[PDB]
Amino acid sequence: EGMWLMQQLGRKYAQMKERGLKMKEYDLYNPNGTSLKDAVVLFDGGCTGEVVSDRGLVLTNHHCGYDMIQAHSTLEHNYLENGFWAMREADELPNKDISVVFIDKIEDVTDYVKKELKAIKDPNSMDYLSPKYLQKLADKKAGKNFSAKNPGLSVEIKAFYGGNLYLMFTKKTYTDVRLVGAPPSSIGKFGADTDNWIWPRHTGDFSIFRIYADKNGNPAPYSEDNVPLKPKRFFNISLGGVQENDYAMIMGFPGTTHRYFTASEVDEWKSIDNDIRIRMRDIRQGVMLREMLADPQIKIMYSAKYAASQNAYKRAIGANWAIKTRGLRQNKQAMQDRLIAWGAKQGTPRYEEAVHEIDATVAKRADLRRRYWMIEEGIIRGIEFARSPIPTEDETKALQASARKEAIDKIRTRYSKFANKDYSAEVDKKVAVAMLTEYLKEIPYENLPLHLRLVKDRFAGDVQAYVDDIFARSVFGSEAQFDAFAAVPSVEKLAEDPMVLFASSVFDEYRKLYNELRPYDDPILRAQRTYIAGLLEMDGDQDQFPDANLTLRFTYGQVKGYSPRDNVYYGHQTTLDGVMEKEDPDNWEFVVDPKLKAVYERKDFGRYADRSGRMPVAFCATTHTTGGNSGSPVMNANGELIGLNFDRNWEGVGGDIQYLADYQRSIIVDIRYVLLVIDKVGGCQRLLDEMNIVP
Amino acid sequence: DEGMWLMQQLGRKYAQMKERGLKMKEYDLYNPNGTSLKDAVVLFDGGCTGEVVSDRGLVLTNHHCGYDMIQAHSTLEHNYLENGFWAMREADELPNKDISVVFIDKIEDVTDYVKKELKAIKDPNSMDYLSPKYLQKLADKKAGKNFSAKNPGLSVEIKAFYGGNLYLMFTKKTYTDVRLVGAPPSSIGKFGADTDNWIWPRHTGDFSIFRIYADKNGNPAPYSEDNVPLKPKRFFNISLGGVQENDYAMIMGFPGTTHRYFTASEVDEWKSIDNDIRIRMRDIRQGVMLREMLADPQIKIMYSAKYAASQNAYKRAIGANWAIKTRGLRQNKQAMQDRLIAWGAKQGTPRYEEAVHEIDATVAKRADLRRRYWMIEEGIIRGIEFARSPIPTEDETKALQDASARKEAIDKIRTRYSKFANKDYSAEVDKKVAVAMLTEYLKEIPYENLPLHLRLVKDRFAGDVQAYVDDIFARSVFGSEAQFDAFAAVPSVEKLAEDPMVLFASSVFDEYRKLYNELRPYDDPILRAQRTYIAGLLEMDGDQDQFPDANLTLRFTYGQVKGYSPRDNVYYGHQTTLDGVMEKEDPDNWEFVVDPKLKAVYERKDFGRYADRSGRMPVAFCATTHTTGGNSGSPVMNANGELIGLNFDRNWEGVGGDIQYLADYQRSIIVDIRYVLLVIDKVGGCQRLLDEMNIVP
Ligand SMILES: O=C(Nc1ccccc1)Nc1cccnc1
Ligand SMILES: O=C(Nc1ccccc1)Nc1cccnc1
Ligand SMILES: [Cl-]
Ligand SMILES: [Cl-]
Ligand SMILES: [Cl-]
């Protein structure tokens, strides 16, 4: 059910032991010694990774190492499509702008932060959640020269439980992290977008890196003199596999949850955030798919834009399914009513006042928040010409020195990036006509961005004519129109440009709405501090976890499938047979790697197949994970690595607000399949040899 | 494999059925010389199965079987199709024109008689052994002089089985006064609608209720207000015990057709010609049609039924090709024929190998013609609406070339034009469909094999399909209403003789008929070789584990209530519940609307004695019985012969079962009788129907 702080391991240990945990408490997490926690890393700021050898080898997801695989790929050596396997340490590829963060120490600094906060004066101050303020407190506690006296180390204080608990983390960061191995994209991203958020899943979502450091194992930026890191702890790899009901646990960095939402915040999330995103993206995606299916060149240009829009669209569909069917609103209402009844009994009305302040703030910002999501989903992300070039003040104060050419060259560079090889003005006009038709029926005239008022005033309500006119008269409507402007440029032409006026007007409204909505966050945050303090005082900091905030957490559960609907059961494990069932050579998402297909045909599974001779691929577990948990190590009852977390099923996305025991699962790539791909597909035996593989 | 057995084969299957769970006595299920459960089974309206469930002739069948009768009695004032129908008294039951129920009174093996009559051979290659006319002459000869007059209501029919190796005579009793008694609303009767056709899990309450009426003596009589309900020989008891996983289940019904004795070459032909062409052509047609329906809500209304009708056999072909590709259907037919050939070599009889060779040679020889036939049939005859545009008859052309018979010819042509260009026809949608269909057709069929008018695409239009189609509509008399009216005001034979649409329609129908006539002679050598082939199979392995192909005659099948795994890590259980109906509810989707009375029953848990042991309300179940088209409405029986459900569909994964039964995938989709009774009781409130049924605890 939760994403527990490392400090909460002591209080959870007995329950974990009753669920199957066999390892000693301090072997998993020791606040003053080496433990399994020391083999977990925050991979590239948004993923989790794990050290799997005494030479700093790191496993994470293929989708986590994707940018590094792509940055090293060329037409001659396409690692993204063919995979990459460095046959020697010297062949491992360095990566610019990469990092791995170890959580060296964690300390509870609540009394210290609360004492420092008493010197504020203004009771409404938001310094208690300010990264700048908390960094000043972290530096004060660590010392005036901490990072100089302790190289590679840094400190950070974060708020938890809405400002009721504070932890200081001592972090060790390594920036020389080299690409060692990756399967082809046909394996690493087998389901591609079709299987995103889907269980059963048959994706071998892994990539391999190596942490490099100086001669003493201290962090150092990329240098050809750097040597692999010998870590204080690494995971042993299990080949025992998994069975239904086996204990499983994860450590990682879940990013965000909303476990303490009021019922009114659940209603807002559904009726505003999700409904608008669903409605607007369904319109955008429908026009886009029609255009992609009718023209193969449009499919090439718009496939990535279409897929990027679909990802959070599917999340919102899954989240709204939970709100509708799992009683998320009702369970938050029961949570707050129980606190209000307990506060009425104790004679402390501040908890009821806090819930009331949240409800009143949610009700007061409704129209503004609806207008913000409507413009953001409808125009800012919905219409490409909304991000067309807007001349800066320096560019207008140049067109009217002979740096008129410099202003035109900068405008041209931005025009060329807007109207790039993937941009179709015809597709964009069709998307804009459908998106603006919806937007204009939902946003009244008095609330419209100034230029959109011309639809009724100048174009007699004809959206098509308004959009046609923007392209026909704009200097960014075509290359010939831009070149005619660039030959005879005037600031008066740019000031009256229909596309410039549209883009400026919709961005002005988007910013005005953002600025009007920002003050509503603070009373909710302050009321949440009181609300969560009451919840903790009433039911204890034992069965209610603090919201995720990109800090190290542990979660435990079992290897278990679930029933998605009446008479349908999805088991706990997928096999290589499922990959072969999904094979479609004329569908780029479901192409099967020939070497992998050969391994399946010959049954060349070695020591990696199960007791029945079937080759496992992935499994699912009742662990509680969210975004940020991609690449997380999945452990046995003995703490051995049995897989990597890489996704979660759409039925469980509502789990960020309320865990769903009968539907929510972490989607994990079986470590046996990872080893089979390294061995039989990559042929990289040296990586198997450096790992500690246990029978 | 797990067959559709003749009633005669019950004796030799009985011990296996008992070991699989059957508890009833053999003669209580089927007795050739007395009353048995077989007497409660009817052929409902020529293509469905039904069953008698009361001593007052009450009959249960599927909602999709009684659909036309429910629709024919529906009006804007009393929409029975939408709201359901529940006659609260026998006098309120609605008569139906052109309806029938057929009882199988007697079945007799007449093989020796037919084979003796056949020996009077004028031609060894004669097809009289399969001729309905010839076999009816033999049936009439055996039954006697004026049998129908001497035994009113009874009729005699002889059918060939096992490719002409076994013959049965059926004495049938037909009743034509069959009245509508009850039906759930369409929201229950066709809950999944087209989306869930061929799908398991299934949540559809596919049932309707009729009543057989007869004269004072229980003898067949056409509709008369003097008719009284039939007191039948036998009726099914209704069980409320339900089903559990692995329970024995059996069905009786009228499966229409199977191809259990196809050679490996016939499986290859079915895949590479029949199925691949139907799949490719319908995918093109459906794709254009769906794009047009999604862009214009008026096009969606006009083309929804045409789109759904095309999709039904398209899905079947996808399911059949999945079995050919993944379940080794070709390989298992090859093993079947190789085993017979090896046995024939040892018996010193080469006629079985010669028979398989004749089938292979005939299949190989007709390949190009059969490919051309399926290409024109799927591509144009079915694919393009203007292919069925009006073609002036020889008498209509003669009438237009000096009498008032000209105005009569124009009125007849106008009537046919008005039926072609009806309220659901869009010339714009049709031109778009034709351009895509003809582009694929012209790519596959060479110039020398094209229907004469299609040669104009290359010769006159420089390969521009769009221009050829545009020209047909721009210049044709049937291209628009204004163009027809201009023709009708000044009609000439010469205008019709040169009409581009008339020439297209005539040309494609001429080619379709020429191909049909060239292909017809190839059927006979295959049929004659199949008689020898199946005779060998029967002599070698016996008429015990190989059932005769279905031929719309009464058969029984047995199996168990069991789910299956459709793919890696996915299991579909044996039973669906009312919960599943509620999960699928979508008020803004006509297919998934939930009846408010049913939704209330679910919320209040007003399940009475119809819910299972755990308090869950069952809806449907699936079984390993072997069924096919014709089995819709079939009674599903317990180990004790009590009614536990009605068969209504089969999953797409098992459609290949018409050639080879698929034990791990093929299932009959059945509506639980507990759900049928729940709907009659709590939705219809028709207590009198429950009271007249014999419901056992
Ligand atoms: O961009 C994506 N796919 C893609 C890329 C190029 C071409 C075609 C498809 N997927 C994606 C996006 C955002 C979140 N998750 C997955
Ligand atoms: O015609 C059908 N459905 C339909 C009718 C009217 C409007 C919309 C849909 N279904 C169908 C089912 C089975 C075989 N053939 C056709
Ligand atoms: Cl370390
Ligand atoms: Cl012979
Ligand atoms: Cl099978």
UniProtKB/Swiss-Prot annotation, chain A:
It is found in: Cell surface. The active site is at 63 (charge relay system), 205 (charge relay system), 630 (charge relay system). Optimum pH is 7.0. One of its GO terms (molecular function) is peptide binding. GO terms for cellular component: cell surface. The keyword NAD does not apply. It comes from Porphyromonas gingivalis (strain ATCC 33277 / DSM 20709 / CIP 103683 / JCM 12257 / NCTC 11834 / 2561). Belongs to the peptidase S46 family. Gene3D superfamilies: Trypsin-like serine proteases (2.40.10.10). Changing residue 315 to A/N: Significant increase (or preservation) of the catalytic activity. Enzyme activity is completely blocked by diisopropyl-fluorophosphates, moderately by phenylmethylsulfonyl fluoride (PMSF) and 4-(2-methyl)benzenesulfonyl fluoride, and slightly by pepstatin in vitro. It is an enzyme of class 3 (hydrolase). Homodimer. This is Asp/Glu-specific dipeptidyl-peptidase. It comes from the Bacteria. Disruption phenotype: Cell growth is retarded. Complete loss of hydrolysis for ac-DNLD- and LE-MCA. The efficiency of peptide utilization of proteinaceous nutrients is reduced in mutant cells.
